[PDB]
Motif scaffolding. Sequence first.
Motif, PDB file in Angstrom:
ATOM      1  N   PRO A  82       4.729  -7.728   7.516  1.00 50.23           N
ATOM      2  CA  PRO A  82       5.771  -6.739   7.198  1.00 50.23           C
ATOM      3  C   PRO A  82       5.761  -6.246   5.756  1.00 50.23           C
ATOM      4  O   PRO A  82       6.367  -5.216   5.455  1.00 50.23           O
ATOM      5  N   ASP A  83       5.051  -6.976   4.864  1.00 46.52           N
ATOM      6  CA  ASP A  83       4.910  -6.664   3.437  1.00 46.52           C
ATOM      7  C   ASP A  83       3.664  -5.889   2.993  1.00 46.52           C
ATOM      8  O   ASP A  83       3.439  -5.674   1.820  1.00 46.52           O
ATOM      9  N   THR A  84       2.876  -5.454   3.951  1.00 48.08           N
ATOM     10  CA  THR A  84       1.695  -4.732   3.649  1.00 48.08           C
ATOM     11  C   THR A  84       1.912  -3.230   3.598  1.00 48.08           C
ATOM     12  O   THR A  84       2.831  -2.696   4.093  1.00 48.08           O
ATOM     13  N   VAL A  85       0.967  -2.576   2.998  1.00 47.06           N
ATOM     14  CA  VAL A  85       1.049  -1.123   2.904  1.00 47.06           C
ATOM     15  C   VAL A  85       0.985  -0.485   4.284  1.00 47.06           C
ATOM     16  O   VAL A  85       1.586   0.572   4.518  1.00 47.06           O
ATOM     17  N   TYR A  86       0.267  -1.111   5.221  1.00 46.68           N
ATOM     18  CA  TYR A  86       0.099  -0.516   6.543  1.00 46.68           C
ATOM     19  C   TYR A  86       1.390  -0.580   7.342  1.00 46.68           C
ATOM     20  O   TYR A  86       1.771   0.399   7.994  1.00 46.68           O
ATOM     21  N   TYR A  87       2.074  -1.725   7.303  1.00 50.42           N
ATOM     22  CA  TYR A  87       3.389  -1.824   7.926  1.00 50.42           C
ATOM     23  C   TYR A  87       4.352  -0.806   7.329  1.00 50.42           C
ATOM     24  O   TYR A  87       5.076  -0.119   8.059  1.00 50.42           O
ATOM     25  N   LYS A  88       4.371  -0.691   6.001  1.00 50.34           N
ATOM     26  CA  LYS A  88       5.340   0.189   5.358  1.00 50.34           C
ATOM     27  C   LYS A  88       5.051   1.654   5.657  1.00 50.34           C
ATOM     28  O   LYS A  88       5.981   2.438   5.880  1.00 50.34           O
ATOM     29  N   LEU A  89       3.775   2.044   5.679  1.00 56.52           N
ATOM     30  CA  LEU A  89       3.454   3.429   6.012  1.00 56.52           C
ATOM     31  C   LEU A  89       3.821   3.740   7.455  1.00 56.52           C
ATOM     32  O   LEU A  89       4.396   4.797   7.741  1.00 56.52           O
ATOM     33  N   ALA A  90       3.504   2.826   8.378  1.00 50.37           N
ATOM     34  CA  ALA A  90       3.844   3.045   9.781  1.00 50.37           C
ATOM     35  C   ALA A  90       5.347   3.206   9.962  1.00 50.37           C
ATOM     36  O   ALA A  90       5.802   4.074  10.717  1.00 50.37           O
ATOM     37  N   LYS A  91       6.133   2.373   9.279  1.00 53.46           N
ATOM     38  CA  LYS A  91       7.583   2.491   9.364  1.00 53.46           C
ATOM     39  C   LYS A  91       8.057   3.814   8.776  1.00 53.46           C
ATOM     40  O   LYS A  91       8.933   4.477   9.344  1.00 53.46           O
ATOM     41  N   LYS A  92       7.464   4.227   7.654  1.00 51.56           N
ATOM     42  CA  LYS A  92       7.875   5.459   6.990  1.00 51.56           C
ATOM     43  C   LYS A  92       7.522   6.686   7.823  1.00 51.56           C
ATOM     44  O   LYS A  92       8.354   7.585   8.006  1.00 51.56           O
ATOM     45  N   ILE A  93       6.288   6.756   8.325  1.00 48.88           N
ATOM     46  CA  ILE A  93       5.886   7.954   9.052  1.00 48.88           C
ATOM     47  C   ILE A  93       6.486   7.999  10.450  1.00 48.88           C
ATOM     48  O   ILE A  93       6.650   9.093  11.003  1.00 48.88           O
ATOM     49  N   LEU A  94       6.841   6.851  11.033  1.00 51.27           N
ATOM     50  CA  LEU A  94       7.560   6.874  12.302  1.00 51.27           C
ATOM     51  C   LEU A  94       8.890   7.602  12.151  1.00 51.27           C
ATOM     52  O   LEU A  94       9.204   8.518  12.921  1.00 51.27           O
TER      53      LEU A  94
END
Length: 104
Positions: A82-94
């Motif tokens: 949950p602390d990675t850039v990939y999790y954060k981007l997926a959450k943001k672009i969703l």
Amino acid sequence: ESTPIQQLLEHFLRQLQRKDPHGFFAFPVTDAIAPGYSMIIKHPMDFGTMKDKIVANEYKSVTEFKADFKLMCDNAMTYNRPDTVYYKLAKKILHAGFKMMSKE
């Protein structure tokens, strides 16, 4: 892509992919790139697979396209810590992607 839906979905896809300029979600994930991915994610999805589905005219509705986009984001938030850039981007672009599509 002569149909209104194909042309609209191509526009949505361009707009969504712009939010992923590094291309984290551009192509299918392999287990070599992301260890354990096939163990964790049962229904993979990516922008490139979505592009091919638009071109092949596989989307019945805009809703079917949105389900693929949510699936790709949900997969990324399930696999990546949950602390990675990939999790954060997926959450943001969703969130930003569905807000964008609600206006068109």
